[PDB]
Design a protein around this ligand. Structure first.
Ligand SMILES: Nc1ncnc2c1ncn2[C@@H]1O[C@H](COP(=O)(O)OP(=O)(O)O)[C@@H](O)[C@H]1O
Ligand SMILES: [Mg+2]
Lengths: 272, 7, 371, 272
């Protein structure tokens, strides 16, 4: 038995997020028994859904909250920093339910809930469709803001699927603060043959702390700048420079700029 | 003049 | 007051007042300077010549096109083309009538400023607008959706226009056009011993290209026929009275539009860039496009080109999509025709950038649009 | 049941990344024995390099050059390991095979200026069939990495009279590019396309059958490559721009709105 559940775990863990549910269906059709797959897939889906960072909607909140390690309470429940209410998330099904209220002193927390509320608007202005969450946690005595932004786009009729992930950590320190983050892009097309795009960028920065409005504006300016430069390179450079590097791996026309001629190619072992 | 229609 | 419609084509400038179904001025967009000294001072000879004056005076002038491939190369030369357009070709003061300029999609944003600044500040236009050429073409063809294959002297442009909009993501600018096609004729003529070098001589070749050349429906079958029998051979005599005898060359030149390989061009051929454009669309509109293939601009005139284009693009598309080629006569001028219709709309008569708007906002009027 | 196991196995091998094919295939035959032979035949996978020790030259391994326990080298004409029988070509087909290897060695040299290739032909009662193989790795001195693989499989029908042959070409191109420049992070792109093309041509006294084959291969590789580059730029532009653009799209929507009303007015003024 144990090999089968490790083979399934690799497929479930690495699956493309427009297609992961279908891959689970594929693996459950491939093997004869449900239980050995279902029980491993729950543990995989915990880890997996957190790294997708994807939201769920809770039926009384009227908003979308992202899911992550910084949100994970243990005991199968997740935080909502805006609404301040914990909830259980199902890892197979679409919905989440039975919420419970969460209380704290919230000093450090309150300072960025403002900044979060600001960020939401700039998300609306970055993505046609887009969702966010800003986590508040003490890490080994450090004071941190963890801000995250998300997009899923899919359509079966188009045979393309396209996805976005972002992580930003800002460490509160007077007068000078530190920043760390990662940005990722994944796209798949499969109409007749297949093509895939995979990417990351990692960012480190230093900042200074002044006022609630100014930090709100500044963090957003960095996110704005970084995402727009990252998109600008990934469109404008790749439409030209990738043609030249792909050409350097295989050419479109030869060094001659002519179609080759079989008579001369057979006969003429042209000089060294 | 060499050329058929030119030099 | 009536509007003036101007088509800033690479080869010929088509111009006239709105509502008219044919332009009032059509001339080669050439600034021609002296090749030699003007010894007979009594002539009143000119620092440069333009249009049909340069083409009459061909043998003594260095003919420069101000647009090459598709971009303006020297603004003052283009400015002379415009000055001549107003004062000489149309015999009007540009201060006195609204003006429409055609423009190509994906032309860099600074060009829009230069054109706008020249038209208000050199030519004092009382109102102005700048339009994507290809849109005007379909518009003129009546239809409210389709794919344009517009090719003049400089750029081949493919645009899928849907619900009356250009879809910018699908626009395939192709650097193969009439001028490039002219060059290749020079070479295949050279094979048979005819030579042409001077820029004057280039324009002679252009006259030949517009007459003897045609598109064969299938290349080696035609060529095998031509290699067998002199029946496919015709002639056309230069200004110096000598006939040129020509066969195999007639289909061979415009074959290049289907085979950019013949010229070493890395870009795909005319049917190809059309398909390659179609496929980029919102999938639901694919069949909306295939029934609505629209050809235009001077290079689209060759006999048999539509029938070939059909048999060609039929291979690329999945079958039974009903691909149809819209290629009647008058497609020499669809682009300018479209502007003439657009400039007849009362809503458009509200929509122009006014002289007063530019006189308050300067070139910054375009920065809201250009991103 | 078992036909659906093979179908969902192939769907899985469409959805999983092409970089991990051999890992994922070994895992998939470990999760399903019995299907191993079907899987190894149906699933396409990167080629394997071989060295002919008698000649001192490289070749590539495929299921057509293989005959049971061993593979025939295109240079020495022997199998490794050696065999008591072996399904050899005819002597004249072998001579043709040498001529093909030489022609396609030039072809590859001109298009790639590196990597390795192989050519093999198998005798048929109605003509000949053939495989052309190519492999090329990227520059290991650079940040940018990659590979390109060619598979062309061709079947030739030699007709009874009028010296025509009909050619049926199948082709697959496998790609991965890894890219690590301009300070905008890194991107990996995977690609796999498959095509078929058919033609009939008259045999000539000046150009042998290989020149025909070759004309199809060149026209096919041009078509495949052009298709590939445009598929990359198409999806990498439209989806990435669509995900993280908003303001340009709002201003273009203002142009759409104005232009709509102009088009509505065109209905009336075109009638007028
Ligand atoms: N009947 C014809 N036969 C061949 N070529 C033609 C014909 N009519 C026009 N052309 C070519 O079209 C080119 C210009 O096309 P056009 O679109 O009218 O100019 P522009 O693109 O500069 O506006 C010229 O170079 C000319 O050679
Ligand atoms: Mg034009």
């Amino acid at each position: 038995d144990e090999e089968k559940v490790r083979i399934a775990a690799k497929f479930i863990t690495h699956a493309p997020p427009g297609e992961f549910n279908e891959v689970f269906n594929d693996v459950r059709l491939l093997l004869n028994n449900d239980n050995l797959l279902r029980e491993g897939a729950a543990h995989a889906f915990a880890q997996y859904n957190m790294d997708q960072f994807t939201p769920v909607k809770i039926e009384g909140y009227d908003d979308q909250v992202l899911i992550t390690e910084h949100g994970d309470l243990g005991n199968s429940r997740f935080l909502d920093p805006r609404n301040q209410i914990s909830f259980k998330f199902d890892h197979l099904r679409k919905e989440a339910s039975d919420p419970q209220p969460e209380d704290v002193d919230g000093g450090l927390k309150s300072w960025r809930e403002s900044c979060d509320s600001a960020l939401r608007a700039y998300v609306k202005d970055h993505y046609s469709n887009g969702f966010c969450t800003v986590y508040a946690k003490t890490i080994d005595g450090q004071q941190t803001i963890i801000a995250c932004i998300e997009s899923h786009q899919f359509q079966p009729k188009n045979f393309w699927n396209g996805r976005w992930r972002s992580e930003w950590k800002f460490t509160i320190t007077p007068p000078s603060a530190q920043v760390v983050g990662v940005l990722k892009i994944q796209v798949h097309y499969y109409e007749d043959g297949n093509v895939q795009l995979v990417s990351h960028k990692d960012v480190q920065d230093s900042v200074t702390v002044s006022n609630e409005v100014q930090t709100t504006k500044e963090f957003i300016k960095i996110i704005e700048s970084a995402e727009n430069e990252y998109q600008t390179a990934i469109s404008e450079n790749y439409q030209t420079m990738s043609d030249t590097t792909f050409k350097a791996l295989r050419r479109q026309l030869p060094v001659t700029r002519t179609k080759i001629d079989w008579n001369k190619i057979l006969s003429y072992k042209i000089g060294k | 003049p060499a050329w058929x229609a030119x030099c | 007051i009536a509007a003036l419609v101007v088509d800033n084509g690479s080869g010929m400038c088509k111009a006239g007042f709105a509502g008219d179904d044919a332009p009032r001025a059509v001339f080669p967009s050439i600034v021609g300077r002296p090749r030699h000294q003007g010894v007979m001072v009594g002539m009143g000879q000119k620092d440069s010549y333009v249009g049909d004056e340069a083409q009459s005076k061909r043998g003594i002038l260095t003919l420069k096109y101000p647009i090459e491939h598709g971009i303006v190369t020297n603004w003052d030369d283009m400015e002379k083309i415009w000055h001549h357009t107003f004062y000489n070709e149309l015999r009007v003061a540009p201060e006195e009538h609204p003006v429409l300029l055609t423009e190509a999609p994906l032309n860099p944003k600074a060009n829009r400023e230069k054109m706008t600044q020249i038209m208000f500040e050199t030519f004092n236009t009382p109102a102005m607008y700048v339009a994507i050429q290809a849109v005007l073409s379909l518009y003129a063809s009546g239809r409210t959706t389709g794919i344009v294959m517009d090719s003049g002297d400089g750029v081949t442009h493919t645009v899928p226009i849907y619900e009356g909009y250009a879809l910018p993501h699908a626009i395939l600018r192709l650097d193969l056009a009439g001028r490039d096609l002219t060059d290749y004729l020079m070479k295949i003529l050279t094979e048979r011993g005819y030579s042409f070098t001077t820029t004057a001589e280039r324009e002679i070749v252009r006259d030949i290209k517009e007459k003897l050349c045609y598109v064969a429906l299938d290349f080696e079958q035609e060529m095998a026929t031509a290699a067998s029998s002199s029946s496919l051979e015709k002639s056309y005599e230069l200004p110096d009275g000598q006939v040129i005898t020509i066969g195999n060359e007639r289909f061979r030149c415009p074959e290049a539009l289907f085979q950019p390989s013949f010229l070493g061009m890395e870009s795909c051929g005319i049917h190809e860039t059309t398909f390659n454009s179609i496929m980029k669309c919102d999938v639901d509109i694919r069949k909306d496009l295939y029934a609505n293939t629209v050809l235009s601009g001077g290079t689209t005139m060759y006999p048999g080109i539509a029938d070939r284009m059909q048999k060609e693009i039929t291979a690329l598309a999945p079958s039974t999509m009903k691909i149809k080629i819209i290629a009647p006569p008058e497609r020499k001028y669809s682009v300018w025709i479209g502007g003439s219709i657009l400039a007849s709309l009362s809503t458009f008569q509200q929509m122009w950038i006014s002289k007063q708007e530019y006189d308050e906002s300067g070139p910054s009027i375009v920065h809201r649009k250009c991103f | 049941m078992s036909d659906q196991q093979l179908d969902c196995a192939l769907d899985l091998m469409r959805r999983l990344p092409p970089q991990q094919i051999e890992k994922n295939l070994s895992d998939l035959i470990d999760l399903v024995p019995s299907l191993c032979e079907d899987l190894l035949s149906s699933v396409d996978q990167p080629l394997k390099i071989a060295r002919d020790k008698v000649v001192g030259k490289d070749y590539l391994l495929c299921d057509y050059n293989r005959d049971g326990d061993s593979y025939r080298s295109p240079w020495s004409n022997k199998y490794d390991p050696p065999l008591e029988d072996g399904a050899m070509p005819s002597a004249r087909l072998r001579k043709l095979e040498v001529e093909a290897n030489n022609a396609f060695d030039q072809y590859r040299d001109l298009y790639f200026e590196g990597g390795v290739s192989s050519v093999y032909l198998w005798d048929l009662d109605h003509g000949f069939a053939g495989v052309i193989l190519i492999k090329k790795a990227g520059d290991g001195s650079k940040k940018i990495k990659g590979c390109w693989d060619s598979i062309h499989v061709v079947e030739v029908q030699e007709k009874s009279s009028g010296r025509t042959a009909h050619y049926k070409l199948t082709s697959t191109v496998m790609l991965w590019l890894q890219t690590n420049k301009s300070g905008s992070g890194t991107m990996n792109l995977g690609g796999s396309l498959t095509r078929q093309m058919e033609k009939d041509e008259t045999v000539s006294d000046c150009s042998p059958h290989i020149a025909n084959i070759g004309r199809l291969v060149e026209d096919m590789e041009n078509k495949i490559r052009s298709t590939l580059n445009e598929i990359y730029f198409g999806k990498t532009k439209d989806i990435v721009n669509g995900l993280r653009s908003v303001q340009t799209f709002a201003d273009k929507s203002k142009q759409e709105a104005l232009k709509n009303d102009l088009v509505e007015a065109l209905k009336r003024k075109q009638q007028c």
